[PDB]
Scaffold this active site. Structure first.
Site, PDB file in Angstrom:
ATOM      1  N   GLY A 119       2.736   7.992   3.433  1.00 51.14           N
ATOM      2  CA  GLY A 119       3.944   7.305   3.005  1.00 51.14           C
ATOM      3  C   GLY A 119       3.616   5.979   2.345  1.00 51.14           C
ATOM      4  N   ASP A 133      -8.655  10.678  13.521  1.00 53.34           N
ATOM      5  CA  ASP A 133      -8.610  10.291  12.109  1.00 53.34           C
ATOM      6  C   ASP A 133      -9.425   8.997  11.861  1.00 53.34           C
ATOM      7  OD1 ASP A 133      -7.944  10.814   9.395  1.00 53.34           O
ATOM      8  OD2 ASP A 133      -5.912   9.964   9.535  1.00 53.34           O
ATOM      9  N   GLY A 160       0.816  -1.207   0.000  1.00 56.48           N
ATOM     10  CA  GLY A 160       0.000   0.000   0.000  1.00 56.48           C
ATOM     11  C   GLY A 160       0.848   1.255   0.000  1.00 56.48           C
ATOM     12  N   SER A 161       0.223   2.401  -0.297  1.00 53.25           N
ATOM     13  CA  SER A 161       0.885   3.709  -0.377  1.00 53.25           C
ATOM     14  C   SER A 161      -0.149   4.834  -0.221  1.00 53.25           C
ATOM     15  CB  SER A 161       1.630   3.850  -1.706  1.00 53.25           C
TER      16      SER A 161
HETATM   17  C1  QFK Z   1      -2.971   2.367   2.044  1.00 52.97           C
HETATM   18  N1  QFK Z   1      -3.027   0.943   1.760  1.00 52.97           N
HETATM   19  C2  QFK Z   1      -2.836   0.032   2.706  1.00 52.97           C
HETATM   20  O1  QFK Z   1      -2.572   0.324   3.869  1.00 52.97           O
HETATM   21  C3  QFK Z   1      -2.988  -1.394   2.301  1.00 52.97           C
HETATM   22  N2  QFK Z   1      -3.356  -1.722   1.011  1.00 52.97           N
HETATM   23  C4  QFK Z   1      -3.461  -3.034   0.966  1.00 52.97           C
HETATM   24  C5  QFK Z   1      -3.797  -3.829  -0.245  1.00 52.97           C
HETATM   25  N3  QFK Z   1      -3.231  -3.594   2.205  1.00 52.97           N
HETATM   26  C6  QFK Z   1      -3.203  -4.913   2.631  1.00 52.97           C
HETATM   27  C7  QFK Z   1      -2.934  -5.196   3.924  1.00 52.97           C
HETATM   28  C8  QFK Z   1      -2.653  -4.161   4.861  1.00 52.97           C
HETATM   29  N4  QFK Z   1      -2.412  -4.589   6.181  1.00 52.97           N
HETATM   30  C9  QFK Z   1      -2.142  -3.841   7.319  1.00 52.97           C
HETATM   31  N5  QFK Z   1      -2.038  -4.498   8.485  1.00 52.97           N
HETATM   32  C10 QFK Z   1      -1.713  -3.741   9.548  1.00 52.97           C
HETATM   33  C11 QFK Z   1      -1.517  -2.374   9.487  1.00 52.97           C
HETATM   34  C12 QFK Z   1      -1.651  -1.812   8.220  1.00 52.97           C
HETATM   35  N6  QFK Z   1      -1.670  -0.405   8.032  1.00 52.97           N
HETATM   36  C13 QFK Z   1      -1.917   0.254   6.881  1.00 52.97           C
HETATM   37  C14 QFK Z   1      -1.869   1.602   7.157  1.00 52.97           C
HETATM   38  C15 QFK Z   1      -2.115   2.753   6.214  1.00 52.97           C
HETATM   39  N7  QFK Z   1      -3.471   3.312   6.365  1.00 52.97           N
HETATM   40  C16 QFK Z   1      -3.629   4.490   5.525  1.00 52.97           C
HETATM   41  C17 QFK Z   1      -4.506   2.325   6.037  1.00 52.97           C
HETATM   42  C18 QFK Z   1      -1.590   1.651   8.543  1.00 52.97           C
HETATM   43  N8  QFK Z   1      -1.462   0.447   9.076  1.00 52.97           N
HETATM   44  N9  QFK Z   1      -1.965  -2.525   7.131  1.00 52.97           N
HETATM   45  C19 QFK Z   1      -2.642  -2.861   4.426  1.00 52.97           C
HETATM   46  C20 QFK Z   1      -2.922  -2.550   3.080  1.00 52.97           C
END
Ligand code: QFK
Length: 267
Positions: A21, A123, A16-17
């Protein structure tokens, strides 16, 4: 708190992004290996988020393994494989109503714990909820989170910044005041997004037009297929008056009873 970089294996492709960041998938050697989600950078804001997360212990809150200082600062978390709640519901519109009630009630439970702990998230949004399974939600993104002072029930921000206005309560806008009650307001917006299967709130509107609309007494309409009772709770979270707006203990109880009522009706 501080993790060994040699025990950490990072995947080349970014999971993810965003403007925050980047998020990378990884492995942390703990007898077993642990699949981790790593947040990459600002240093003061990353350490501050880690400091908040370290104090939190709840099933509906993303767990922090620790922090690592290498090429860039790293926030190492327990992996929630299904990613952000809003992106998931967008990609799976066949998810039943009962399953949406189950997931938003889990968020209210994590938020109830967060309120008891006198922590304001600031948030709360569907982009910041992660799915472990299709039936298991966790709250993440504690970068704007504040531990409330022993003498105050709100956090006062000193001047404006990069703010998600469509999720913010009128007192956050009008007095820079952030409380658990203002997190309740964001939760109502979060409920709206989940029942609209990851759709953005206040479609095509500017931040100021949203303030103008809420001030007139206008609120977002009932999403297609969303039950009367869930839209009533949404509107209650959207109580302009901070004093008369419910706290998470009452919001979680309404959701808990409604979920069991739908569960009973099911079989
Ligand atoms: C922005 N895209 C993603 O975060 C994302 N995209 C896909 C496809 N993911 C798959 C698994 C995953 N897992 C996962 N586990 C534990 C913590 C996290 N955190 C993600 C954030 C960022 N916040 C803006 C959401 C903070 N913590 N993320 C995340 C993502």
């Amino acid at each position: 708190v501080y993790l060994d970089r040699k025990l950490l294996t990072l995947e080349d492709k970014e999971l993810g992004s965003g403007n925050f960041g980047t998020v990378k998938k990884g492995y942390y050697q703990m007898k077993v290996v642990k699949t981790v989600a790593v947040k990459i950078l600002l240093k003061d804001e990353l350490l501050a988020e880690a400091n908040v997360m370290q104090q939190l212990d709840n099933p509906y809150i993303v767990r922090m393994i620790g922090i690592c200082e290498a090429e860039s600062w790293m926030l190492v978390m327990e992996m929630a494989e299904l990613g952000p709640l809003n992106k998931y519901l967008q990609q799976n519109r066949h998810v039943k109503d009962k399953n949406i009630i189950e997931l938003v009630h889990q968020v209210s439970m994590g938020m109830k714990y967060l309120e008891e702990s006198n922590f304001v998230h600031r948030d709360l949004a569907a982009r910041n909820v992660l799915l472990v399974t299709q039936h298991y939600a966790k709250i993440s993104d504690f970068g704007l989170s504040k531990a409330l002072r022993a003498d105050e029930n709100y956090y006062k921000a000193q001047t404006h910044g990069k703010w998600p206005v469509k999720w913010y309560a009128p007192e956050c806008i009008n007095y820079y005041k952030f409380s658990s009650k203002s997190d309740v307001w964001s939760f109502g917006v979060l409920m709206w997004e989940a029942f609209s299967y990851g759709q953005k709130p206040y479609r095509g509107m500017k931040g100021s037009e949203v303030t103008a609309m809420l001030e007139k007494g206008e609120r977002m309409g009932c999403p297609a297929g969303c039950p009367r009772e869930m839209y009533d709770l949404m509107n209650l979270c959207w109580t302009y008056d901070v004093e008369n707006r419910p706290g998470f203990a009452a919001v979680e109880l309404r959701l808990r009873n409604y979920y069991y009522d739908v569960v009973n009706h099911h079989h």
